[PDB]
Amino acid sequence: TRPLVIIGAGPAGLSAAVYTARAGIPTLVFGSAPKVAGDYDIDNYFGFDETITGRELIERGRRQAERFGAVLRDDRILGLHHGDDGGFRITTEAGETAACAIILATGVSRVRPGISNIADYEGKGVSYCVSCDGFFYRGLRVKVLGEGVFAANQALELLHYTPHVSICTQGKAASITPEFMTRLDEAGIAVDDRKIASLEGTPALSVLRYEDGSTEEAQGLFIAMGEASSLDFAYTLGVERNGVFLGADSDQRTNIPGVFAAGDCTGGFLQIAVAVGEGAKAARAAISYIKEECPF
Ligand SMILES: Cc1cc2nc3c(=O)[nH]c(=O)nc-3n(C[C@H](O)[C@H](O)[C@H](O)COP(=O)(O)OP(=O)(O)OC[C@H]3O[C@@H](n4cnc5c(N)ncnc54)[C@H](O)[C@@H]3O)c2cc1C
Ligand SMILES: [Cl-]
Ligand SMILES: [Cl-]
Ligand SMILES: [Cl-]
Ligand code: NA
Secondary structure, rough: EEEEEEEOOOOOHHHHHHHHHOOOOOEEEEOOOOOOOOOEEEEOOOOOOOOOEHHHHHHHHHHHHHHOOOOOOOOOOEEEEEEOOOOOOEEEEEEEEEEEEEEEEEOOOOOOOOOOOOOHHHHOOOOHHHHHHHHHHHOOOEEEEEEHHHHHHHHHOOOOOOOOOOEEEOOOOOOOOOOOOOOOHHOOEEEEEEOOEEEEEEOOOOOOOOOOOOOOEEOEEOOOOOOHHHHHHHHHHHEEEOOOOOOOOOOOOOOOEEEEOOOOOHHHOOOOHHHHHHHHHHEEEEEEHHHHHHOO
């Protein structure tokens, strides 16, 4: 089992990776280019008296982490679960892997579902965590909302509870890879790009209303838009939330041992300067955690 995985390759995850790798801990970082990493002027990050682009600042962060031995991977994470037993099981598009300690640095970027009355059906049909709520919809007709590999994997997990699963990409282009498409086809899980306008049903969800005015029956709607997010991981790990953010103490510890959180996903002042300090503090906490708990 690896001692440490960092999920996130923005300022928080990279600042943390620099510190952990310098302390001699084999460091594996998962993440892709953050949203800030484009042609945007950064002018308020300490130490840069001349304008630097987000793309270039992040690129220097990456070279900095690699300089001290951090390995950076572009793999998207699909799920995080407590391992059986001990440490954490990390689901990626490529397969599985495992880690003794996790630093969550996945930011707050989120594809939104775009359903006018979705809030009316929270707890009554609309769910998020499959391991959490899947059993309640066993044998039932369940729709997964989302366009990506995350949606595809959530749909496949749902098969543990019901054979009656399909995916709606909510008007978006699907970005499901051919390997996942194969798996969906083999399982009889259909994918279409219809757009759900609203939900219907009187004690609970029973009908999806498409922007057409056409309808489909479903008693379960699992939201899985875009990429798996900090909230999605929180649901499966049992990490306590603070509104839409992860709860973290001043040392970036969550309520789950071995799980730390840093950057935008702990939501205060959503800035590079802030993320870089949280990443550093998370690293310090992880390093001492690993020394007591994870031999390597
Ligand atoms: C255009 C733009 C301009 C900005 N301008 C400024 C500015 O001038 N000054 C300033 O201080 N701040 C600015 N910000 C805000 C600043 O970028 C953020 O506060 C900062 O990047 C937070 O860093 P982070 O590491 O917490 O998250 P992010 O930068 O969002 O990075 C999150 C990381 O998580 C990874 N990730 C997420 N989900 C997964 C997954 N499922 N699997 C694998 N990896 C995943 C992402 O790929 C990314 O690598 C700007 C942001 C944007 C977008
Ligand atoms: Cl700056
Ligand atoms: Cl143990
Ligand atoms: Cl209702
Ligand atoms: Na924060």
